[PDB]
């Protein structure tokens, strides 16, 4: 509906992802026909940027109240599941960090803080 993007640095919404058109007598390419959340993945994967992350939790270091593990979220809450520092010792315990309170994991003891982006 507006100016078309070339890289994901110029994408301020769904209004920048329509694209140019194909020509008469040609099987069209995906860079000439894609609109929604499909073209956003396409413009991510031709550079090396993974838009939808699939990397699990940090299971290296514990959590002190002075130095807590920072969990990043775009909301005021995010559900965090702890299962240990050697990554399978602690059982599955779920926690909800909030911007006003830190979770502390009643069995092993790691502290989680929320980073609001």
């Amino acid at each position: 509906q507006f100016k078309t993007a070339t890289s994901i640095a110029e994408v301020e919404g769904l209004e920048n992802l329509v694209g140019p058109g194909a020509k008469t007598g040609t099987v069209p390419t995906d860079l000439e026909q894609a609109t929604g959340l499909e073209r956003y993945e396409l413009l991510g994967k031709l550079e090396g940027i993974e838009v939808f992350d699939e990397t699990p939790l940090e299971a290296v270091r514990k959590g002190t109240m002075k130095d807590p593990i920072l969990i990043d979220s775009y909301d005021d809450y995010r559900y965090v599941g702890c299962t240990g520092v050697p990554a399978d010792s602690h059982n599955i315990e779920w926690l909800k960090p909030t911007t006003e309170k830190n979770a502390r994991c009643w069995e092993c003891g790691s502290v989680y803080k929320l980073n609001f982006l």
């Binding site: 994967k45 031709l46 550079e47 090396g48 940027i49 982006l117």
Partner: peptide
């Protein structure tokens, strides 16, 4: 925050 840069080793894999 600092933006995530793109690995140029997973870029040639998609274009191959």
């Amino acid at each position: 925050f600092t933006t995530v840069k793109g690995d140029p080793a997973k870029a040639q894999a998609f274009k191959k």
